[PDB]
Amino acid sequence: ITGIPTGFTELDRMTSGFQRSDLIIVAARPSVGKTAFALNIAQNVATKTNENVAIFSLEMSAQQLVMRMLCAEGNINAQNLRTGKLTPEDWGKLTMAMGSLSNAGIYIDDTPSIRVSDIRA
Amino acid sequence: KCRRLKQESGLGMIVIDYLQLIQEVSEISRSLKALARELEVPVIALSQLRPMMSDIRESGSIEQDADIVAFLYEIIIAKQRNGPVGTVQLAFIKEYNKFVNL
């Protein structure tokens, strides 16, 4: 394994990372889960390694993104974060999910739609 | 059976599984109310049918005998004589088969 680990055992094997200088394009039809896939890699690289990740989220807002990876952790949500109130099981969960993702190396930029030069800057 | 259990051990709740399945129902409704009254115990009679009042009413009285009529949908307490009438909302697990708080 090279690289930068994906988190996902057998994705790692074919690729050995994610390695440095390579442009990886992940394509999928609307609502197959391409964002929710890129987010989970971002997450696993943030919480498990020690390596800052930069996420540009041109479509969805910066904070509507965070719950989507807060949910992806503490295994939270049908109860739901969205629809107000939670159970003592949800609360006592978010707190850890918030705590573990708190020390992660994620940087989000939701700037509406930005030119490449800016991404690069 | 409930009568004999009260004198020998205690008793606090009678939870009957579904009424429509006991063995016209207006005459049973009547008797369940009296049972509760005799034993100074809340009797929970489950029933089978959105929902609202006329869904069960059209099939054997009940309405004027039961002093509190709950609906599972949301828990809709559609009639109670203690006071308030409205919607209480409960979470439901499935895997564990629990209804839980919120």
Query: Coil, helix or strand for B8?
Result: helix
Q: What's the Cα-to-Cα distance from B94 to each of A71, A94, B91, B99, rounded to whole Å?
A: 19, 21, 10, 8
Distance in angstroms (rounded) separating the CA atoms of residues B15 and A111 = 58
Distance in angstroms (rounded) separating the CA atoms of residues A68 and A63 = 9
**DSSP per residue, A8-23:** -HHHHHHHS---TT--
The whole-angstrom distance between B70's CA and the closest CA on chain A is 22
> Of residues A10, A51, A59, A73, which has the active-site annotation?
A59
Q: What angle do CA B100, A63, A60 make, to 5 degrees?
A: 110
Q: Are B60 and B32 in contact (CB under 8 A)?
A: no
Distance in angstroms (rounded) separating the CA atoms of residues A86 and A97 = 14
Distance in angstroms (rounded) separating the CA atoms of residues A112 and A59 = 7
User: Are A79 and B101 within 8 A, CB to CB?
Assistant: no
Is the N-terminal amide bond of A18 cis, ω within 30° of 0?
yes
In this structure, what token pair is assigned to residue B76? 């809709």
Give the experimental resolution in Å: 4.0
Give contacts of B90 with chain A, Cβ < 8 Å: none
Pairing of strands B91-92, B14-16: unpaired
B71-91 residues labelled b (16+ CB within 10 A) or e (exposed): beeeebebeeeeeeeeeeeeb
Structural method: X-ray
CA torsion through residues A15, A18, A22, A28, sign: positive
User: Are B91 and A87 within 8 A, CB to CB?
Assistant: yes
The whole-angstrom distance between A64's CA and the closest CA on chain B is 22
Query: Coil, helix or strand for A84?
Result: coil
